Amino acid sequence: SARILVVDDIEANVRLLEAKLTAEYYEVSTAMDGPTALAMAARDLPDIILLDVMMPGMDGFTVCRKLKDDPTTRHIPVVLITALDGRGDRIQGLESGASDFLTKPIDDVMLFARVRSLTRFKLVIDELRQREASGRRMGVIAGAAARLDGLGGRVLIVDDNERQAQRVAAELGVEHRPVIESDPEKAKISAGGPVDLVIVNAAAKNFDGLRFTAALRSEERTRQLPVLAMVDPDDRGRMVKALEIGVNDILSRPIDPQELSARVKTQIQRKRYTDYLRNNLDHSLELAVTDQLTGLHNRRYMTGQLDSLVKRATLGGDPVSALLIDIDFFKKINDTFGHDIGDEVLREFALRLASNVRAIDLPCRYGGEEFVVIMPDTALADALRIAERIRMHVSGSPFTVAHGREMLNVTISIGVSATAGEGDTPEALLKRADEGVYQAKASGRNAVVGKAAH
């Protein structure tokens, strides 16, 4: 399935790993020191590299760093092999560029869970690299907005262990936007909304987290959704089961902050690369989920996502907010200047909008001239403030119209609203936002107006 380069200074650890891997029909090469590994990686371009941190002369951290310095090998996932008490090693491993970790003595189930995961990721890395090897001509100048970190990202934690769920949220909260669900039926709804990753407790007390995963896998809206399962390290059949059922990778308890950070980045990056490929690239009807001109989301895609979000909010829990933006006198711009100038303005606006709103929000080409931002887990009072932030960035700087040679002042009107309890509807939320835009032009344009229920 893949070509693996194993690196360790002890010729015995290398043979044991080599034997285990080729018994599962991987193609394995070896290196007993750093310089050898770097030369072989550049020559062979392996799919992944298993790298021991402890080596005399040049250690694994140095090798890992050097693999990222070389533009030829940068793209190859590196797994570091650490000792039992490997906190220091994992922290240093992260800053030296490692993709994930494995602990000695090596657990076979972890070993293969890890290789399969990064192998799957390597497929999409290679595919994306092929695309980029075509442009030069317009390096997709026909598209913009395009986030490909593993960072930001809405992470749904499905766990009835309050204490642990809350710790996992706090760990992921610096680099991500976590959300907790303890009811599995409520989680099913959230999960069909804009979620980048699900983390499920496979050892929960009140629901079967594997039965929940299988459910995600049997419905269109959640079938491609990445899933990490938290598992008890003493229950081996259960770990095997989870991987057979389509869990992407597993996190042993107690949950290690550095392992957590790493597996999460992996899965979110895999998803984003995958999505980026699905889109871009050419055109189509009902298929289609982005706007060609701006590179924002469709209305089609947005209403799908907004359906789940509002449904979740009506069963208690956090509200959703909606912004309806209209560019002031936009039709008058299409007349007195060209439609080509009009495109330039639409693209520039889309860029500033998406820049100043979270990756987990949903900025959309709602219509020809109107834009919408759906914001999960956001109250009206916060959404007003966000709208003012967007309003300032567009009004605070002139747009570059005629292919570099002219400046153009632009302002927007924004209407704002948030969900409100058991009766509320997507239709009703956007109607309130629509009233808000209408009143913002009644006050004299270039303003923000909130509309609440009731």
Added chain:
Amino acid sequence: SARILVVDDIEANVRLLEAKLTAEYYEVSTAMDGPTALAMAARDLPDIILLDVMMPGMDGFTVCRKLKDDPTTRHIPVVLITALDGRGDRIQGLESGASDFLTKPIDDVMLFARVRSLTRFKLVIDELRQREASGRRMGVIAGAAARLDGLGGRVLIVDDNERQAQRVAAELGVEHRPVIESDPEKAKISAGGPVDLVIVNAAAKNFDGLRFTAALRSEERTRQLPVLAMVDPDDRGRMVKALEIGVNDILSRPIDPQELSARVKTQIQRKRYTDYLRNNLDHSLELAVTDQLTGLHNRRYMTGQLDSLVKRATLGGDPVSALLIDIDFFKKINDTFGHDIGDEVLREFALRLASNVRAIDLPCRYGGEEFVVIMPDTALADALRIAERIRMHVSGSPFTVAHGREMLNVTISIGVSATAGEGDTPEALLKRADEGVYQAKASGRNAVVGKAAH
């Protein structure tokens, strides 16, 4: 992962199957008789149906037939459960519409191999049905050529057991185009060519068939190729392994003609559904393997396939033939009549070409006006005859030009060639055919001319 409906009259066989399936986190419903099963299938629309052939009043064959009479349930894969000596059952099962089979007493590994396979197929069945639920508007009027049977199709048999390989080829030769390789290294090359399915002996003597399968899975050209493995049923570890490495489904030895025919249909049909979905649908550069106007293959796509075909032919074994077609006075048609009339001519010709040549051949839009057909396993003497067949169908009938309101005579000139020996190349092959087309015009067009290596 999926919703399964199990049907059998003995409330105990049903409970045992139900228990096994829900233990793997499938969603299982049951029916104890025919009328119940039909009502439940229509109401629930399960992903697959497991159906016992023996029931009083209304047997499984009748149920199966009735499931295919209903336009609501037609699309659902049905697996028939037969007795030990089930030849009569399997033959009747095929003519009543079954997708595959399982033998009592039920083997758990077969059971799940069969469910996972048809589940994966059901994903693509549902995807295709969603597309078709959009048109009415132009039911892809912008696409023509589209084979979606499980029939025809080039099947590569990778096996060093002469007698068994040759017997499988005979069973497949009625409905398919089989090819035998006994050398795995030669088969690796063959498999990168235009192949719809590989069948590998997992119990071979001179090579490891699982190592061969693994190698297919680790290269872009062969990664997506359906594989069936022939297995000794007494060796369980080996069957399980094959499934882990990526074998799509397995075939018990000695090989049963009806089981063989069924799994082969599944795999080839799944592949074609998938390929049709990747194409059609919108547009793109280097990505894109079909011509938009005609729906034939790209030149890019063709040259890829041709390379593997010629590489294989230079290492011994059967030759490859190439037709180069040139529509006579085509630029003159573009002048006196419109480019819209030319498009209509290019579509008609494409349709007639594709219809009168095998599905395992590669008809292509080679340039703006010129066309190429590559033919695997075809000697020069046969290519000449095939070129004449095409030439007749195009000149034997007038084309319909102006949206039905004007008819038009059209002829073609064809150059024909075939590989020869160790030295040969794609470059040389096409060059030789190109001289054929040159000479065919020098005779006065509407002709065929072959060019032999030397």
